[PDB]
C-alpha cells in the first residue's frame, strides 16, 4: 500500500548487481589471507573475528571462522590466562559464544572486586564497558552476573555519557548511544552491520580494505532486499486480495522483515521471499479469526483448515470461502515451484502444522466474541499454540538447501525447548506490543489483558510482570542457542537466535514493548533505499 508502489517501480540496473558481486569476489581472498594468516596469535583472530560479524562479513568465511574457533576454545584457559583487558575478555565471550561454544562467566572475576561487585576502576575503560554491556544480553538462566553487568556498564556508561569528557570524541559517543538504545543482541545483523560501518568508518586505525569489503557486502544486500519486496508486491497484486476482501492490511515490508530478521545472506534470497509469501498469506488467515465471525462460520473455516479443502459446496460466506482458496493456491503453487527443489514436503507441512493453531485460534474467537477475559494462564496454553513457532521456523527451512527436510522436521515435531521459550517470547512481546490495536478490535483475551484482570494490576505493572517472563525466555533460547551445537545444524539454531533479536526490534521499546510499524520507520530507508556511498 504505502511502500508497495515505491517497490514496484524502483529500478535495479544489473549491472550494478554483477559489479558490487565481482568486487566483493575479488577482495574476499585478500580478507581471508587476513584470518589464515600465520603470522597473527588467537587473539588478534578473535579481533578479526568479532569485526567481521560486527560489519555483517562473517558469513563469507564461515567455514574458516568456525574452524579457527573450534580449535582455539580447546585452548580458551590457556589464551586468558592474565588477560587483563576488558574488551578483550568481552570480545572472546561473544565470539565465542555467538558461535556456540560456551564461555564461561568466570571470565569476568577478574574485573570483580572483593564486594562482589564490577571494579569502580573500570569506568575508564569506556570500549570495555559498551563490550561489556552489549555481552551481558548473552546470558543463560542461571548467569545472573549479567543482569549485573549489565546494570553496571549502563549506568557507568550513562554517566560518561552525561559528563565532560564525552563530547571529545563524538563517533564513539554516537557509538555507544546506539548501543544503549539499541543493544547487538535485540537487534537484527544487517541493522547492526549498517551502524557498524559508520562507526568503524570513523574509527582512526581503521581497516580500509574491510571498511570498503562491508560496505559492498551491505550494498550487495540491499540490492537483494529491494528486488525481493520488488518481486513481493508484484506477487502480492497479482493474488489481488485487496479487490476481492474489505479488511487487508499492508503487511508488506513486516513480511519481508519475517524472513529478513531470520537471514539476512544473499544466498538466503529465495529462502526469504518464501517466507515473506508464507506470512503475507497466513496473516490474511489469521485475521479472519475475528470476534466479527459468527460460530457457524468459524467452525466452517476451522474445519476446512483440518481437512485442508475446500468446503465442499456444503457450505458459508463469500469472504471466508475467497479466503480458504486463496491460502490453498498460494501454498499449492509454492510446493510446486519447491518441487523441482526437491523442498515440496515442507511446504507441505505449513498447513499441517497450522491445523492446531487454527483450532486455537477458534477458542481466541469464542473469547472475545462473548467479551470473556480468561485467566491469564489458562490464555497461555492457548497463545503458545497459537504462536506458532514451530510453524515460523518451517518456513524459514524450506529455502534452505543445507538443511535436510527430515532432519529439520524432526527436530520441530520432538518440540525443542527452544521452540517453546521463542513462543512465549512471541507471544508475550505481540500482545503486549499489539495492545492498543487489540482493544481497538475487541481482543480482549490477551496476553496483557488477562494479566491485568487475573492479578488487579494496572497496564503498566503487567507490562513490567510479562517483561521478565520475556527476558528468562530470551535467557533460554541462548542456552539451547549454545547446548544444541553439535546435535542441531548450527544453520537451524542460527534461525532461532534471530527470531528472537527479530522480536526484539518489532516489539521492545525501552522497557515495555511497542508496534513494530513505529520501529520500522527508524530504520526503513538505511534497509530498502539508500546504499552506502562509496570511498
Ligand atoms: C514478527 C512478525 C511481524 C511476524 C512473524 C510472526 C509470524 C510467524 C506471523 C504473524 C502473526 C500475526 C498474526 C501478526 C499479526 S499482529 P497479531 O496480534 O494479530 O498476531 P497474533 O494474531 O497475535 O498471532
Ligand atoms: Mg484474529
Ligand atoms: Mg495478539
Redesign the pocket.
Known amino acids: 500500500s504505502l511502500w508497495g508502489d515505491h517497490f514496484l517501480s524502483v529500478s535495479l540496473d544489473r549491472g550494478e548487481f554483477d559489479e558490487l558481486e565481482r568486487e566483493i569476489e575479488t577482495m574476499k581472498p585478500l580478507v581471508k589471507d587476513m584470518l589464515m594468516s600465520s603470522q597473527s596469535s588467537d587473539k588478534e583472530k578473535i579481533r578479526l573475528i568479532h569485526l567481521l560479524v560486527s560489519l555483517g562479513s562473517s558469513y563469507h568465511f564461515d567455514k574458516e571462522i568456525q574452524d579457527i574457533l573450534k580449535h582455539s576454545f580447546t585452548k580458551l584457559d590457556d589464551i586468558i590466562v592474565g588477560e587483563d583487558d576488558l574488551e578483550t575478555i568481552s570480545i572472546m565471550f561473544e565470539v565465542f559464544r555467538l558461535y556456540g561454544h560456551k564461555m564461561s562467566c568466570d571470565a569476568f572475576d577478574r574485573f570483580r572486586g572483593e564486594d562482589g561487585r564490577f571494579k569502580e576502576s573500570l569506568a575508564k575503560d569506556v570500549r570495555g564497558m559498551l563490550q561489556l554491556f552489549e555481552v551481558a544480553h548473552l546470558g543463560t538462566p542461571s548467569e545472573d552476573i549479567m543482569d549485573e553487568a549489565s546494570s553496571f556498564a549502563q549506568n557507568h556508561l550513562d554517566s560518561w555519557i552525561g559528563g565532560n569528557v564525552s563530547g571529545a570524541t563524538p563517533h564513539l559517543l554516537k557509538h555507544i548511544q546506539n548501543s544503549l538504545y539499541i543493544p547487538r543482541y535485540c537487534n537484527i545483523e544487517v541493522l547492526v552491520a549498517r551502524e557498524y560501518i559508520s562507526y568503524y568508518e570513523q574509527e582512526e586505525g581503521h581497516n580500509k580494505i574491510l571498511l570498503k569489503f562491508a560496505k559492498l557486502n551491505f550494498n550487495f544486500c540491499q540490492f537483494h532486499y529491494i528486488q525481493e519486496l520488488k518481486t513481493l508486491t508484484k506477487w502480492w497484486k497479482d493474488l489481488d486480495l485487496a479487490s476481492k476482501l474489505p479488511y487487508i492490511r499492508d503487511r508488506l515490508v513486516?513480511?519481508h522483515?519475517?524472513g529478513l530478521?531470520p537471514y539476512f545472506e544473499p544466498h538466503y534470497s529465495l529462502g526469504r521471499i518464501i517466507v515473506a509469501k508464507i506470512?503475507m498469506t497466513?496473516?490474511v488467515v489469521?485475521?479472519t479469526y475475528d470476534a466479527h465471525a459468527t460460530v457457524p462460520e468459524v467452525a466452517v473455516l476451522t474445519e476446512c483448515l483440518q481437512r485442508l479443502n475446500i468446503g465442499a459446496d456444503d457450505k458459508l460466506p463469500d469472504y471466508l470461502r475467497t479466503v480458504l482458496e486463496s491460502v490453498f493456491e498460494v501454498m499449492g503453487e509454492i510446493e510446486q515451484e519447491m518441487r523441482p527443489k526437491g523442498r515440496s514436503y515442507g511446504v507441505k507441512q505449513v498447513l499441517e502444522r497450522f491445523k492446531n493453531v487454527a483450532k486455537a485460534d477458534k477458542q481466541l474467537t469464542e473469547w472475545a466474541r462473548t467479551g470473556d477475559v480468561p485467566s491469564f494462564d489458562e490464555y497461555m496454553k492457548v497463545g503458545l499454540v497459537?504462536?506458532?513457532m514451530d510453524?515460523?521456523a518451517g518456513?524459514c527451512f524450506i529455502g534452505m538447501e543445507d538443511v535436510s527436510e527430515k532432519e529439520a522436521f524432526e527436530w520441530l515435531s520432538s518440540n525443542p525447548l527452544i521452540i517453546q521459550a521463542l513462543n512465549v517470547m512471541?507471544r508475550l512481546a505481540?500482545?503486549v506490543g499489539?495492545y492498543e490495536?487489540?482493544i481497538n478490535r475487541g481482543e480482549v483475551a490477551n496476553g496483557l489483558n488477562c494479566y491485568m484482570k487475573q492479578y488487579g494490576v494496572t497496564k503498566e505493572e503487567a507490562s513490567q510482570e510479562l517483561r521478565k517472563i520475556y527476558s528468562n525466555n530470551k535467557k533460554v533460547v541462548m542456552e539451547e542457542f549454545m547446548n544444541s551445537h553439535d546435535h542441531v545444524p548450527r544453520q537451524v539454531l542460527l534461525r532461532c537466535l534471530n527470531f528472537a533479536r527479530?522480536?526484539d526490534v518489532?516489539y521492545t521499546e525501552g522497557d515495555g514493548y511497542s508496534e513494530?510499524k513505529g520501529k520500522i520507520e527508524h530504520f526503513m530507508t538505511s534497509l530498502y533505499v539508500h546504499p552506502i556511498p562509496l570511498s
Open positions: 513486516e513480511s522483515l519475517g530478521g506470512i497466513m496473516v489469521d485475521d497459537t504462536a506458532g510453524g515460523y518456513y512471541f505481540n500482545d499489539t490495536t487489540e527479530l522480536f518489532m513494530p
